[PDB]
Amino acid sequence: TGELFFRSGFGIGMRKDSPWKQQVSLSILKSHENGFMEDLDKTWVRYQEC
């Protein structure tokens, strides 16, 4: 019931002095443009049984 408020998304937490903090952000944006995260969404999150 109701609308949405405090709209914030999920992320991967990493420490500040991490060498991998740049290669992860370039892989999530690449998986949103080729349709990789919509197979993961229709398999676990979207079979609406009732």
Place this chain on the structure above:
Amino acid sequence: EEYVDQVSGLSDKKFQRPNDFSPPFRFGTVPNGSTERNIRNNYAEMHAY
């Protein structure tokens, strides 16, 4: 009662095979943007159409 949508998304038969129906479905976009770059890398024939 309640109405229903005409298409289901970008993976519909009307967007992939426009010539296999009635006088073809007419869809397009404005170039020089991000949606054109997204469509070009994922669909070639649809991009040209």
